[PDB]
């Protein structure tokens, strides 16, 4: 079960500090920027009932309804704002923020439908692409840095 509790505005950004945005094919990149509207998130807390962890929504700020899922273990943004209510101990909208052991300030979002799955950047070519993937101890790609304001 998730109740949702509070949002927060919130500009995520991997380690290599590029941040990330929705382009106009509704995909998730990630960019150096120096166009913004889309750049800018919404953060969604939950309770969880199982106790699990910080449960989130992500969704985009400046659109009418869009939230990030993972369905399908791919990444993608349905047409719905973030539910009051969510009635089920797993969801493709819904993620666990996890503060990392040994690095300050890094964030990884693990999905609660799928165990041991991580948002992660993925170069692909001239692309940093958000993607789902599994977790090596370290691994950079799935650490982001979040800027609540």
């Known amino acids: 079960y998730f109740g949702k509790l509070e949002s927060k505005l919130s500009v995520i ?23 913004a509207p889309r750049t800018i998130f919404i953060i969604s807390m939950y309770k ?9 929504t992500i969704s985009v700020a400046c659109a009418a309804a ?3 899922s993972c369905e399908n273990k791919i990444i ?6 973030p539910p009051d209510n969510i009635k089920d101990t797993k969801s493709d909208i819904i993620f666990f923020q996890r503060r990392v052991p040994g690095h300050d300030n890094k964030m990884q979002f693990e999905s609660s439908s799928y165990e041991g799955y991580f948002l992660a950047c993925e170069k692909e070519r001239d692309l940093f692409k958000l ?11 799935i650490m982001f840095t979040v800027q609540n304001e």
């Open 131 to 141: 993607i789902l993937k599994k977790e090596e101890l370290g691994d950079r790609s």
């Open 76 to 81: 993608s943004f349905k047409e719905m704002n």
């Open 66 to 68: 869009s939230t990030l």
């Open 48 to 56: 969880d009932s199982q106790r699990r962890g910080m449960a989130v």
């Open 13 to 35: 950004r991997n380690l290599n500090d590029q941040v990330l945005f929705i382009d106009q094919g509704n995909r998730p990149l990630f960019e150096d920027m120096t166009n």
